[PDB]
Each structure stands twice: as structure tokens, then as C-alpha cells.
Amino acid sequence: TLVHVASVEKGRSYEDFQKVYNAIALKLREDDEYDNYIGYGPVLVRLAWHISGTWDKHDNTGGSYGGTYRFKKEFNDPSNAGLQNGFKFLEPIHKEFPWISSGDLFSLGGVTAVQEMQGPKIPWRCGRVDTPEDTTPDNGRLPDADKDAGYVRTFFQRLNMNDREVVALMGAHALGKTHLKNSGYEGPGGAANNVFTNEFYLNLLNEDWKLEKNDANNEQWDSKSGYMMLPTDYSLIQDPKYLSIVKEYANDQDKFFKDFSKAFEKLLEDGITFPKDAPSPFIFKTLEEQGL
Ligand code: HEM
Ligand SMILES: Cn1cncc1C=O
């Protein structure tokens, strides 16, 4: 398999990355109108996941390391429709801090978004290094939404995620919304879609879901409250193993936060070899903690 060794941007340390975090966090606060006042947090979380979710454990292709989303093949992946909004948000940040690698910037955008939306602290490591256009993974490595629990389980084995990690990661679907023009699905998953909570699990268990067709002729699960779940989301309450874990997170906010933090860091670091003398993971302070 390919080896990708983390290489710290020359001379940089925690303070440098905290400044980048702060610039992203301040722009998140500033650009509040986006997507009918949802703001950019959810799309930045999705971007960090999609740049990581191309990874294949079998040969170490894809993954966040190479920053390959910047290349046309990947940014034009139909699975990535709408993420251009996140990329455009990050452009002025990259211009201000041209020394940060693209993979570091995209992954840090996700960490910053989660924390600024009052989610768990996500430790983050620097050292992703931009790789050439020919290292861009082909389209088709990101998951389909119209599938069942068996599909989800098998899909995530490629990313070395187990049942607990899958169910934890999926809690991010509390955030933002599906947009018909991007993915052929429409609607939010709950009421608090720019604040990071365990609402995804509570809504799965507590809403009265009806299997309906949307205006793109795709099936999705809809509630009277105006929420929606993808078939792959709903599969987490159809499969008995996933259901137990859904119930656990619906009943323990802290446990969900801790497990999401671990799985999300792991997702963002898949494929990267960290030297034994690499810096420890950074835990950034939020703007609120800094009084900014
Ligand atoms: C079976 C796995 C998954 C499937 C099939 C899936 C599918 C989707 C789809 C179809 C959308 C709507 C995109 C749009 O129309 O704009 C979406 C949105 C989103 N996804 Fe996932 N997803 C999966 C896993 C994940 C994971 C693991 C995360 C992160 C931990 C994540 C984070 C998000 C976020 C934050 C949004 C909202 C984006 C926005 O509001 O712009 N998803 N997902
Ligand atoms: C609302 N939703 C349901 N599944 C995914 C999403 C995006 O947030």
C-alpha cells in the first residue's frame, strides 16, 4: 500500500493553526445568511467527510492526505455536488494562510465547524501534504443513500469503521439539510440544524416516519414535523445492531460526543502515518472560550 507520512508545515506550531481555526470560525459567524441562515457549518463538516471518505484501506488510495478535492475530477464528483460552496468559503482562508496544505485546511474546516456549532472537541493533527493530480481518486467511492443497513455496514468496512463508529458518525445528519438539486433528497433532519446535538437519534426513535416520494422521484422518510431521513439513515433503526446503538446515543449526549469525536478524528486521519516524534494532536479553543 502507499505510505503517506505527515510532514509538519515548515516551522508551524499550535498557535499557527489556532489562527487558521479562528479565521474559519470568524467567517462562520460573519457569513450567517448562507442556505437560509443555516450558515456554512454543516457544509464544512460534509466537505471534511467527503475528502476523507474516498479512502480505501486496501491500498491507501484516496483519503484526506493529498488534498485532491482541489482537482476537477474530484470536485466534479456527482457525490460532491454542493461542496463547492464549502470550498469557496475556505478560499479566502487559504489566501490568508497560503502555507497550510489543502488537506489540512479541508479537515480543519470540519473540526472548526463542529466545535463552533457547540459540538465536542475534536483533536486534530497537521501534516497532510498536497499530492499531484494523478493521485486523485476516481468518482464512485462515496456512499449511495438509497440503500439498506447491509450496504452501509459493508461500505464502511472499506474505511475501517465498525458498527459503533458508523452510528456515531451518522449523527452528523442532525446538521444542515438535504437539497433536491444536489442529491435528489430534500429537507432537514430536525429543528436544531446548525447546533451539534444528538437530535438525529432522538428524531429517528421519536418521530412518526412515513415513506414518501420526493419531487425527484426518490424515496425518503418524512415526519409531520417537516423532518426527513435518507433510506440509509432509517436503516439504523431497521437493523437490530444499529438500533441498540441509536438508543444508546439518544439517551447519552456525552457518550455520543465522545464517540463522535474519536470516529471523526479517525476518519480525518485514515491513510496518514504519523512519525513517532510528530507533535501531539492539537485541541483548539473555540472563539467563545477565547472571548473572541
Ligand atoms: C451512509 C453514509 C452517508 C450517506 C449515504 C450520506 C448522504 C448524504 C446526502 C445525500 C446528503 C445531502 C447532500 C445535499 O443534498 O446537499 C448529506 C448531507 C450531509 N451529510 Fe451525509 N451521508 C452519509 C454519511 C455522512 C457522514 C459520515 C457525515 C459526517 C460525519 C455526513 C455529514 C453530512 C452533513 C453535515 C450533511 C449536510 C450538508 C449541508 O447541509 O450542506 N454524512 N449526506
Ligand atoms: C437531513 N439529513 C438527513 N440525512 C442527511 C441529512 C443531512 O443533514
GROMACS .gro file of C-alpha atoms and ligand atoms in nm:
model
  343
    1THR     CA    1   0.000   0.000   0.000
    2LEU     CA    2   0.101   0.365  -0.046
    3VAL     CA    3   0.265   0.536   0.251
    4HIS     CA    4   0.173   0.898   0.334
    5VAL     CA    5   0.392   1.040   0.609
    6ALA     CA    6   0.264   1.350   0.790
    7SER     CA    7   0.505   1.640   0.741
    8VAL     CA    8   0.451   1.950   0.957
    9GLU     CA    9   0.423   2.272   0.754
   10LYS     CA   10   0.769   2.422   0.798
   11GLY     CA   11   0.820   2.589   1.137
   12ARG     CA   12   0.449   2.588   1.227
   13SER     CA   13   0.307   2.506   1.569
   14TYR     CA   14  -0.022   2.510   1.764
   15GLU     CA   15  -0.052   2.891   1.757
   16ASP     CA   16  -0.036   2.899   1.377
   17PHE     CA   17  -0.320   2.650   1.344
   18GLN     CA   18  -0.526   2.822   1.614
   19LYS     CA   19  -0.505   3.137   1.397
   20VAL     CA   20  -0.641   2.942   1.096
   21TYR     CA   21  -0.916   2.789   1.317
   22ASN     CA   22  -1.003   3.142   1.436
   23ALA     CA   23  -1.020   3.280   1.081
   24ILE     CA   24  -1.258   2.999   0.978
   25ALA     CA   25  -1.463   3.046   1.297
   26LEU     CA   26  -1.491   3.424   1.247
   27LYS     CA   27  -1.603   3.377   0.886
   28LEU     CA   28  -1.860   3.120   1.003
   29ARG     CA   29  -2.002   3.385   1.234
   30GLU     CA   30  -1.985   3.657   0.962
   31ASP     CA   31  -2.141   3.470   0.669
   32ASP     CA   32  -2.460   3.380   0.853
   33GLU     CA   33  -2.709   3.416   0.564
   34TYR     CA   34  -2.592   3.109   0.369
   35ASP     CA   35  -2.851   2.839   0.297
   36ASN     CA   36  -3.143   3.030   0.450
   37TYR     CA   37  -2.950   3.116   0.768
   38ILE     CA   38  -2.820   2.767   0.839
   39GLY     CA   39  -2.471   2.910   0.783
   40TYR     CA   40  -2.165   2.726   0.649
   41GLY     CA   41  -2.105   2.488   0.940
   42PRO     CA   42  -2.287   2.183   0.803
   43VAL     CA   43  -2.140   2.204   0.451
   44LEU     CA   44  -1.788   2.235   0.600
   45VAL     CA   45  -1.849   1.918   0.804
   46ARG     CA   46  -1.969   1.741   0.490
   47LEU     CA   47  -1.665   1.862   0.296
   48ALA     CA   48  -1.423   1.726   0.560
   49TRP     CA   49  -1.601   1.390   0.546
   50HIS     CA   50  -1.614   1.368   0.166
   51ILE     CA   51  -1.244   1.449   0.123
   52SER     CA   52  -1.169   1.172   0.374
   53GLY     CA   53  -1.435   0.921   0.266
   54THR     CA   54  -1.261   0.839  -0.062
   55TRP     CA   55  -1.006   0.635   0.136
   56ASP     CA   56  -0.957   0.265   0.062
   57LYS     CA   57  -0.784   0.073   0.343
   58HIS     CA   58  -0.675  -0.198   0.096
   59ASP     CA   59  -0.426   0.014  -0.097
   60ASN     CA   60  -0.427   0.352   0.083
   61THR     CA   61  -0.568   0.533  -0.218
   62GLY     CA   62  -0.789   0.840  -0.161
   63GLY     CA   63  -0.812   0.987   0.188
   64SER     CA   64  -0.762   1.341   0.322
   65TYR     CA   65  -0.381   1.347   0.294
   66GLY     CA   66  -0.333   1.463  -0.065
   67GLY     CA   67  -0.587   1.746  -0.078
   68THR     CA   68  -0.708   1.609  -0.412
   69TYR     CA   69  -1.058   1.766  -0.389
   70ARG     CA   70  -0.888   2.074  -0.543
   71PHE     CA   71  -0.867   1.881  -0.875
   72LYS     CA   72  -1.153   1.880  -1.125
   73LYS     CA   73  -1.217   1.505  -1.130
   74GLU     CA   74  -1.294   1.507  -0.756
   75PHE     CA   75  -1.467   1.844  -0.715
   76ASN     CA   76  -1.694   1.748  -1.005
   77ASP     CA   77  -1.783   1.409  -0.850
   78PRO     CA   78  -2.165   1.398  -0.855
   79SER     CA   79  -2.139   1.273  -0.493
   80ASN     CA   80  -1.978   1.608  -0.408
   81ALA     CA   81  -2.247   1.833  -0.557
   82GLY     CA   82  -2.291   2.137  -0.332
   83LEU     CA   83  -1.948   2.110  -0.163
   84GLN     CA   84  -1.819   2.383  -0.395
   85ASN     CA   85  -1.990   2.620  -0.151
   86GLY     CA   86  -1.759   2.497   0.127
   87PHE     CA   87  -1.456   2.521  -0.097
   88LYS     CA   88  -1.543   2.881  -0.190
   89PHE     CA   89  -1.586   2.965   0.180
   90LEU     CA   90  -1.236   2.831   0.250
   91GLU     CA   91  -1.069   3.012  -0.041
   92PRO     CA   92  -1.008   3.342   0.136
   93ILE     CA   93  -0.881   3.148   0.438
   94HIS     CA   94  -0.626   2.968   0.217
   95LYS     CA   95  -0.526   3.301   0.060
   96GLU     CA   96  -0.459   3.447   0.407
   97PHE     CA   97  -0.268   3.136   0.519
   98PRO     CA   98  -0.110   3.008   0.199
   99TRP     CA   99   0.129   2.788   0.399
  100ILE     CA  100  -0.139   2.539   0.508
  101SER     CA  101  -0.185   2.228   0.291
  102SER     CA  102  -0.520   2.172   0.121
  103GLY     CA  103  -0.595   1.850   0.316
  104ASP     CA  104  -0.509   2.025   0.643
  105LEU     CA  105  -0.738   2.316   0.550
  106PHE     CA  106  -1.034   2.099   0.443
  107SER     CA  107  -1.013   1.875   0.750
  108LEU     CA  108  -0.959   2.169   0.985
  109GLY     CA  109  -1.270   2.334   0.837
  110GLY     CA  110  -1.475   2.033   0.956
  111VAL     CA  111  -1.321   2.035   1.306
  112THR     CA  112  -1.378   2.411   1.335
  113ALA     CA  113  -1.739   2.380   1.222
  114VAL     CA  114  -1.819   2.100   1.470
  115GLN     CA  115  -1.668   2.289   1.764
  116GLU     CA  116  -1.814   2.627   1.676
  117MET     CA  117  -2.160   2.463   1.648
  118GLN     CA  118  -2.117   2.360   2.013
  119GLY     CA  119  -2.011   2.004   1.932
  120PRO     CA  120  -1.739   1.802   2.103
  121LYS     CA  121  -1.371   1.899   2.091
  122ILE     CA  122  -1.211   1.712   1.801
  123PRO     CA  123  -0.834   1.670   1.837
  124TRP     CA  124  -0.666   1.747   1.505
  125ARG     CA  125  -0.322   1.675   1.363
  126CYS     CA  126  -0.139   1.871   1.096
  127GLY     CA  127   0.090   1.741   0.824
  128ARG     CA  128  -0.119   1.641   0.524
  129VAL     CA  129   0.080   1.720   0.207
  130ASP     CA  130  -0.067   1.814  -0.131
  131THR     CA  131  -0.019   1.539  -0.389
  132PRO     CA  132  -0.038   1.565  -0.774
  133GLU     CA  133  -0.346   1.549  -0.995
  134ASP     CA  134  -0.280   1.186  -1.094
  135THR     CA  135  -0.329   1.079  -0.727
  136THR     CA  136  -0.693   1.199  -0.737
  137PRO     CA  137  -0.926   0.905  -0.669
  138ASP     CA  138  -1.193   0.821  -0.928
  139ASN     CA  139  -1.557   0.912  -0.861
  140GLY     CA  140  -1.779   0.648  -0.702
  141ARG     CA  141  -1.608   0.585  -0.366
  142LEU     CA  142  -1.865   0.784  -0.161
  143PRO     CA  143  -2.182   0.607  -0.040
  144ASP     CA  144  -2.529   0.585  -0.200
  145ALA     CA  145  -2.827   0.700   0.008
  146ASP     CA  146  -3.096   0.468  -0.134
  147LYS     CA  147  -2.960   0.151   0.026
  148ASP     CA  148  -3.011  -0.065   0.338
  149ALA     CA  149  -2.823  -0.147   0.658
  150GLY     CA  150  -2.618  -0.425   0.496
  151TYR     CA  151  -2.495  -0.182   0.233
  152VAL     CA  152  -2.398   0.074   0.498
  153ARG     CA  153  -2.215  -0.184   0.707
  154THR     CA  154  -2.018  -0.324   0.413
  155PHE     CA  155  -1.948   0.025   0.274
  156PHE     CA  156  -1.789   0.145   0.596
  157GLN     CA  157  -1.561  -0.163   0.629
  158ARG     CA  158  -1.361  -0.003   0.345
  159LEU     CA  159  -1.298   0.295   0.578
  160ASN     CA  160  -1.215   0.061   0.869
  161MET     CA  161  -1.523   0.170   1.068
  162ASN     CA  162  -1.724  -0.067   1.286
  163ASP     CA  163  -2.095  -0.050   1.383
  164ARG     CA  164  -2.041   0.193   1.672
  165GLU     CA  165  -1.822   0.422   1.459
  166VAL     CA  166  -2.077   0.421   1.175
  167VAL     CA  167  -2.371   0.504   1.400
  168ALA     CA  168  -2.171   0.777   1.577
  169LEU     CA  169  -2.056   0.934   1.251
  170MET     CA  170  -2.410   0.935   1.115
  171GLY     CA  171  -2.521   1.168   1.397
  172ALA     CA  172  -2.377   1.449   1.186
  173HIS     CA  173  -2.700   1.415   0.985
  174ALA     CA  174  -2.863   1.632   1.253
  175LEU     CA  175  -2.678   1.915   1.074
  176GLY     CA  176  -2.784   2.116   0.768
  177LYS     CA  177  -3.021   1.961   0.518
  178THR     CA  178  -3.057   1.760   0.202
  179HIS     CA  179  -3.103   1.980  -0.109
  180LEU     CA  180  -3.303   1.840  -0.401
  181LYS     CA  181  -3.072   1.994  -0.663
  182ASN     CA  182  -2.757   1.849  -0.506
  183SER     CA  183  -2.855   1.493  -0.418
  184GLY     CA  184  -3.216   1.425  -0.517
  185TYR     CA  185  -3.328   1.443  -0.149
  186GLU     CA  186  -3.497   1.734   0.029
  187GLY     CA  187  -3.526   1.859   0.384
  188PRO     CA  188  -3.369   1.896   0.732
  189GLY     CA  189  -3.340   1.618   0.991
  190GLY     CA  190  -3.458   1.819   1.290
  191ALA     CA  191  -3.509   2.160   1.446
  192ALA     CA  192  -3.153   2.244   1.556
  193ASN     CA  193  -2.961   2.205   1.234
  194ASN     CA  194  -2.673   2.440   1.297
  195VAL     CA  195  -2.614   2.331   1.657
  196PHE     CA  196  -2.438   1.995   1.708
  197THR     CA  197  -2.653   1.771   1.932
  198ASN     CA  198  -2.772   1.410   1.948
  199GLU     CA  199  -3.107   1.511   1.787
  200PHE     CA  200  -3.053   1.269   1.494
  201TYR     CA  201  -3.101   0.970   1.725
  202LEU     CA  202  -3.392   1.119   1.920
  203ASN     CA  203  -3.572   1.204   1.594
  204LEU     CA  204  -3.513   0.857   1.449
  205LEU     CA  205  -3.673   0.700   1.756
  206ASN     CA  206  -3.945   0.952   1.837
  207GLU     CA  207  -4.083   1.094   1.510
  208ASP     CA  208  -4.361   0.923   1.314
  209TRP     CA  209  -4.185   0.848   0.984
  210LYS     CA  210  -4.370   0.789   0.655
  211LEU     CA  211  -4.202   0.651   0.344
  212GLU     CA  212  -4.276   0.908   0.069
  213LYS     CA  213  -4.151   1.007  -0.273
  214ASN     CA  214  -3.993   1.347  -0.315
  215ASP     CA  215  -4.009   1.569  -0.623
  216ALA     CA  216  -3.705   1.396  -0.773
  217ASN     CA  217  -3.896   1.064  -0.761
  218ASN     CA  218  -3.676   0.922  -0.485
  219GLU     CA  219  -3.798   0.763  -0.162
  220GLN     CA  220  -3.724   0.928   0.171
  221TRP     CA  221  -3.870   0.905   0.520
  222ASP     CA  222  -4.065   1.214   0.623
  223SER     CA  223  -4.224   1.327   0.950
  224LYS     CA  224  -4.521   1.557   1.022
  225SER     CA  225  -4.271   1.796   1.189
  226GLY     CA  226  -4.115   1.855   0.845
  227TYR     CA  227  -3.805   1.643   0.901
  228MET     CA  228  -3.655   1.378   0.674
  229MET     CA  229  -3.426   1.076   0.686
  230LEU     CA  230  -3.247   0.905   0.397
  231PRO     CA  231  -3.307   0.530   0.347
  232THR     CA  232  -2.953   0.478   0.481
  233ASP     CA  233  -3.037   0.685   0.794
  234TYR     CA  234  -3.356   0.491   0.855
  235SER     CA  235  -3.164   0.164   0.814
  236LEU     CA  236  -3.002   0.240   1.153
  237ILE     CA  237  -3.336   0.163   1.323
  238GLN     CA  238  -3.422  -0.132   1.094
  239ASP     CA  239  -3.106  -0.329   1.177
  240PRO     CA  240  -3.114  -0.462   1.539
  241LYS     CA  241  -2.743  -0.399   1.599
  242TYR     CA  242  -2.755  -0.043   1.477
  243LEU     CA  243  -3.080   0.015   1.668
  244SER     CA  244  -2.920  -0.065   2.005
  245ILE     CA  245  -2.650   0.194   1.940
  246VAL     CA  246  -2.903   0.455   1.821
  247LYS     CA  247  -3.086   0.409   2.152
  248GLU     CA  248  -2.761   0.446   2.346
  249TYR     CA  249  -2.677   0.779   2.181
  250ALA     CA  250  -3.036   0.905   2.210
  251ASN     CA  251  -3.001   0.852   2.585
  252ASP     CA  252  -2.649   0.979   2.648
  253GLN     CA  253  -2.536   1.312   2.499
  254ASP     CA  254  -2.187   1.290   2.647
  255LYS     CA  255  -2.124   0.936   2.520
  256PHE     CA  256  -2.233   1.040   2.174
  257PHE     CA  257  -1.999   1.343   2.184
  258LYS     CA  258  -1.702   1.133   2.296
  259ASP     CA  259  -1.762   0.858   2.037
  260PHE     CA  260  -1.827   1.103   1.753
  261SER     CA  261  -1.505   1.291   1.838
  262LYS     CA  262  -1.297   0.972   1.820
  263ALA     CA  263  -1.458   0.846   1.496
  264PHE     CA  264  -1.438   1.182   1.324
  265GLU     CA  265  -1.072   1.230   1.408
  266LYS     CA  266  -1.008   0.873   1.289
  267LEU     CA  267  -1.198   0.939   0.963
  268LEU     CA  268  -0.992   1.255   0.900
  269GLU     CA  269  -0.663   1.074   0.973
  270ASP     CA  270  -0.722   0.748   0.783
  271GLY     CA  271  -0.429   0.678   0.549
  272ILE     CA  272  -0.178   0.900   0.730
  273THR     CA  273   0.137   0.773   0.901
  274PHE     CA  274   0.237   0.998   1.190
  275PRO     CA  275   0.608   0.983   1.285
  276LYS     CA  276   0.671   0.884   1.648
  277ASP     CA  277   0.812   1.234   1.711
  278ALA     CA  278   0.525   1.420   1.538
  279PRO     CA  279   0.351   1.681   1.753
  280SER     CA  280   0.064   1.558   1.971
  281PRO     CA  281  -0.287   1.628   1.838
  282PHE     CA  282  -0.399   1.989   1.884
  283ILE     CA  283  -0.719   2.079   2.066
  284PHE     CA  284  -0.828   2.422   1.954
  285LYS     CA  285  -1.010   2.669   2.174
  286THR     CA  286  -1.344   2.794   2.043
  287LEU     CA  287  -1.397   3.168   1.978
  288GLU     CA  288  -1.623   3.166   2.285
  289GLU     CA  289  -1.350   3.015   2.505
  290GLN     CA  290  -1.109   3.284   2.382
  291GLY     CA  291  -1.356   3.569   2.441
  292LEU     CA  292  -1.345   3.648   2.069
  293HEM     C1  293  -2.417   0.611   0.450
  293HEM     C2  294  -2.344   0.722   0.463
  293HEM     C3  295  -2.392   0.860   0.416
  293HEM     C4  296  -2.475   0.891   0.315
  293HEM     C5  297  -2.547   0.798   0.214
  293HEM     C6  298  -2.490   1.034   0.312
  293HEM     C7  299  -2.567   1.106   0.224
  293HEM     C8  300  -2.593   1.240   0.235
  293HEM     C9  301  -2.675   1.316   0.143
  293HEM    C10  302  -2.747   1.256   0.020
  293HEM    C11  303  -2.676   1.444   0.186
  293HEM    C12  304  -2.747   1.566   0.122
  293HEM    C13  305  -2.647   1.645   0.036
  293HEM    C14  306  -2.718   1.763  -0.024
  293HEM     O1  307  -2.825   1.741  -0.088
  293HEM     O2  308  -2.673   1.880  -0.007
  293HEM    C15  309  -2.595   1.452   0.305
  293HEM    C16  310  -2.574   1.568   0.376
  293HEM    C17  311  -2.487   1.579   0.481
  293HEM     N1  312  -2.401   1.480   0.530
  293HEM    FE1  313  -2.410   1.283   0.478
  293HEM     N2  314  -2.414   1.088   0.414
  293HEM    C18  315  -2.353   0.984   0.480
  293HEM    C19  316  -2.267   0.995   0.587
  293HEM    C20  317  -2.224   1.113   0.646
  293HEM    C21  318  -2.115   1.126   0.742
  293HEM    C22  319  -2.031   1.006   0.792
  293HEM    C23  320  -2.104   1.256   0.774
  293HEM    C24  321  -2.003   1.324   0.868
  293HEM    C25  322  -1.960   1.273   0.983
  293HEM    C26  323  -2.204   1.329   0.699
  293HEM    C27  324  -2.229   1.464   0.706
  293HEM    C28  325  -2.326   1.531   0.635
  293HEM    C29  326  -2.363   1.668   0.660
  293HEM    C30  327  -2.307   1.761   0.768
  293HEM    C31  328  -2.469   1.700   0.557
  293HEM    C32  329  -2.544   1.833   0.539
  293HEM    C33  330  -2.472   1.919   0.435
  293HEM    C34  331  -2.539   2.052   0.411
  293HEM     O3  332  -2.632   2.088   0.488
  293HEM     O4  333  -2.496   2.123   0.315
  293HEM     N3  334  -2.272   1.238   0.620
  293HEM     N4  335  -2.543   1.326   0.332
  294LIG     C1  336  -3.123   1.594   0.700
  294LIG     N1  337  -3.037   1.480   0.663
  294LIG     C2  338  -3.080   1.356   0.671
  294LIG     N2  339  -2.987   1.280   0.631
  294LIG     C3  340  -2.884   1.354   0.596
  294LIG     C4  341  -2.914   1.477   0.619
  294LIG     C5  342  -2.834   1.599   0.608
  294LIG     O1  343  -2.844   1.662   0.711
   0.00000   0.00000   0.00000
